[PDB]
């Protein structure tokens, strides 16, 4: 589904958590970032920076009642839910 993605355009705290944890993990795994390590050593704060900026290498698969799914990118989603 392209413009057929009927779920909300907002990202939930659950999704947020998965994202944050994911990026924090990636930080601890020496992953590249969208926002540079500006002094701060804490991955959660580091992630928080690019998280706030929605600069996240990520898409979430939501699901339909028939088992299908929707493509919601981080940039697509509104970080307020």
């Amino acid at each position: 589904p392209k413009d057929q993605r009927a779920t909300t355009p907002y990202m939930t705290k659950y999704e947020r958590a998965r994202i944050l944890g994911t990026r924090a993990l990636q930080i601890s795994m020496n992953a590249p970032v969208f926002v540079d390590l500006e002094g701060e050593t804490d991955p959660l704060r580091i992630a928080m920076k690019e998280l706030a900026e929605k600069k996240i290498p990520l898409v979430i698969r939501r699901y339909l009642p028939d088992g299908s799914f929707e493509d919601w990118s981080v940039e697509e989603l509104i970080v307020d839910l």
Binding site: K13, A17, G21, A24, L25, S28, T41, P43
Partner: protein
């Protein structure tokens, strides 16, 4: 190299003796066990015929693997005689309410729309319940059966052309009572005799797939002959524990023992039939085997016929070993012991924050956490190494990238380490670590919380006094339930899960989970009285006191 996968569809049913033999690791035929009777070994056809490993015996179907990531292997004892499985005896018994002998089908058919409506039941579990309800009236295997349309035309199908027998409870088996009992002086009262397993198998032999499936079941995964036990599994020692009490003693799975007894009993039967014996001698030995097996499998057999193991111990059957309540289902399946946990007595402390716990340094001394090496923390990590497992702000282990959990207690590396990115520095627990705390029992989220660490001298948990509200607690020796997260991701989640702000108000009634301390409240009431005024010097100290003070009097 097997691909990493996840189970999506588990097909259930009963195992096929045929396939069982085909996949059998060993035939298993020895009525005895370990050391072949004092020879420092195991048994030719039991215990070691390519079966699972034991302590220091690599075996494991001669695939070694020690006994770490090493599953064992099952042998399979073919049975000379067929044994009725109890859980299916009851089912078969009910099935027999509609069974028609020699026709591969039942007493009822399509020649009656009402029967067709019973047949029209989608759920076969209900379908045959209705069939049982109906077929029990006039259970007669008529050879030719009148068609619904013009009954003068009869449809042949009653392969045994006679009345059908009824069933009565009789110990290990059931008694066949062949209907009869006809008008001519109660002619041939229901021919009484214990039902033959072979007779039942003859039924199974003639059962068609069409009708078998009209009764549900599963012609592939649940076939009627698999209700009869004709070959039994022989678990590897890990599954049917060998055991060793005190010092290198025995005490093994008594089912191995009882099974050997069953086999020995079978052997005496083998003799009774092979060399010859009274049919009653043969009868009883077999009756006993049905008995031994029934109780072997599940010792919950009709109360009275429930023998106690040779040391006066209610034979612990397969089911007994596998029961619930506690047993297995709750014993481990609904609750396992946690390696990163604690049970430590709590206490109050008015100086601490809601999520700042005064954590006993004695605990900090005993607990650690697997951090990883990054270029922006290496120096601090080498300080942990220099601190060793001695300092409370030190470390105990480091997993070297190769998978080596380095023990700093004995290592001289306190002054020497080549930390590369990602080594798991198992440091001591430090302040602010989001550790779980809880008070059981409870029927609400409030009670499980994640909080920041504040290490303390003296020990006991120094807690914000208001914590007792959401926990409905007190400080009466309550050994707080702790669980320490090992995942960084989880640590982040915990700030997003059990933070006080995220818990304090419950949508249940949408209420805050605590209020002002009763001493404080009354004091405040006094504080809010019209005559309440305060001295500057008192105020000054208060102004310092209050952390929110902006510097303005």
């Amino acid at each position: 190299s097997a691909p990493l996968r996840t189970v999506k569809e588990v097909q259930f049913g009963l195992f096929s003796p045929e396939e069982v033999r085909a996949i059998s690791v060993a035939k298993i035929r020895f009525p005895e066990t370990m050391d072949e009777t004092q020879t420092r070994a195991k048994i030719g056809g039991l215990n070691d015929p390519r079966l699972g490993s034991i302590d220091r015996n690599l075996k494991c179907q001669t695939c070694q693997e020690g006994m770490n990531e090493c599953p064992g292997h099952f042998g399979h004892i073919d049975l000379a005689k067929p044994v009725f499985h109890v859980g299916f005896i009851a089912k078969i018994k009910k099935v027999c309410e509609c069974v028609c002998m020699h026709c591969g089908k039942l007493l009822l058919d399509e020649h009656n729309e009402l029967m067709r409506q019973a047949l029209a039941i989608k759920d076969s579990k209900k379908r045959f319940a209705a069939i049982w309800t109906l077929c029990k009236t006039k259970m007669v295997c008529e050879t030719d059966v009148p068609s619904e349309d013009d009954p003068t035309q009869l449809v042949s199908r009653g392969g045994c052309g006679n009345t059908q027998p009824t069933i009565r409870k009789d110990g290990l088996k059931l008694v066949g009572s062949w209907k009869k009992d006809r008008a001519t002086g109660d002619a041939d009262e229901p021919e009484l005799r214990v039902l033959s397993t072979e007779e039942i198998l003859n039924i199974f032999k003639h059962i068609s797939v069409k009708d078998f499936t009209s009764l549900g079941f599963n012609e592939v995964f649940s076939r009627p002959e698999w209700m009869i036990l004709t070959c039994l599994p022989v678990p590897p020692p890990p599954v049917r524990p060998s055991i060793s009490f005190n010092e290198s003693q025995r005490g093994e799975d008594d089912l191995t023992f009882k099974l050997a007894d069953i086999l020995k009993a079978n052997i005496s039967l083998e003799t009774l039939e092979h060399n010859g014996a009274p049919h009653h001698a043969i009868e009883e030995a077999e009756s006993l085997l049905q008995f031994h097996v029934a109780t072997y499998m599940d010792n919950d057999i009709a109360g009275q016929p429930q023998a106690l193991q040779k040391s006066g111990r209610p034979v612990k059957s397969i089911r007994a070993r596998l029961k619930g309540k506690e047993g297995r289902i709750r014993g481990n399946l609904m609750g396992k012991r946690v390696d990163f946990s604690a049970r430590t007595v709590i206490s109050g402390d008015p100086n601490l924050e809601l999520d700042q716990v005064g954590v006993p340094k004695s605990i900090a001394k005993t607990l650690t956490y697997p951090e990883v090496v990054t270029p922006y923390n290496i120096d601090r990590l080498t300080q942990l190494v220099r601190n060793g497992p001695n300092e409370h702000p030190g470390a105990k282990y480091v997993i070297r990238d190769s998978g080596d959990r380095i023990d700093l207690r004995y290592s001289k590396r306190a002054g020497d380490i080549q930390l590369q990115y990602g080594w798991k520095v198992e440091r001591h627990i430090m302040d602010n670590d989001p550790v779980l705390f809880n008070r059981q029992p409870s029927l609400h989220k409030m009670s499980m919380m994640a909080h920041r660490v504040k290490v303390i001298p003296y020990s006991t948990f120094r807690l914000n006094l208001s914590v007792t509200s959401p926990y409905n607690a007190d400080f009466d020796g309550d050994e707080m339930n702790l669980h320490v997260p090992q995942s960084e991701e989880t640590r982040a989640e915990l700030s997003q899960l059990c933070a006080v702000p995220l818990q304090i108000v419950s949508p249940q009634s949408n209420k805050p989970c605590m209020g002002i301390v009763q001493d404080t409240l009354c004091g405040i009431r006094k504080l809010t009285l019209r005559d309440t005024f305060i001295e500057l010097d008192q105020v000054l100290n208060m102004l310092y006191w209050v952390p929110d003070w902006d510097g303005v009097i």
